[PDB]
């Protein structure tokens, strides 16, 4: 009888949000295959 | 074969007691992409 429902919650309210974030392991792999990838193909057989 | 202006690097290594142990000049081996763009670099290598 003290809390008015239109005033808003009086307890703890858990908000949320999606975030784009790559892990460290995923970034290390991306460096391996996209910037440190010096395989013979992708260099000489690219035509 | 070279017989004779600055594309070299001074390479330094130190040990734990702050002492330089290498202090040597060096030159970078060509990348395979550089060989692809200039095949005479493989001949020089």
């Amino acid at each position: 009888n003290e809390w008015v429902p239109t005033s808003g919650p009086a307890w703890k309210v858990p908000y949320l949000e999606n975030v784009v974030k790559r892990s460290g392991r995923r970034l290390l792999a991306e460096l391996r295959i996209a910037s440190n990838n010096g395989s013979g193909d992708r260099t000489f057989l690219d035509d | 074969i070279r017989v004779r202006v600055e594309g070299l690097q001074q390479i330094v290594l130190r040990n734990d007691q702050g002492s330089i142990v290498l202090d040597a000049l060096g030159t970078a081996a060509p990348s395979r992409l550089a060989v692809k763009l200039d095949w005479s670099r493989l001949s020089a290598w």
Partner: peptide
């Protein structure tokens, strides 16, 4: 072509089209 021609060419841009035109010429 002749053997004199091939000995003065050297590898070039894309090396797979090279080395196969050369091989066909050497076989010829």
């Amino acid at each position: 072509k002749t053997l004199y021609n091939y000995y003065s060419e050297g590898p070039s841009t894309p090396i797979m089209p090279h080395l196969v035109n050369r091989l066909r010429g050497l076989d010829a």
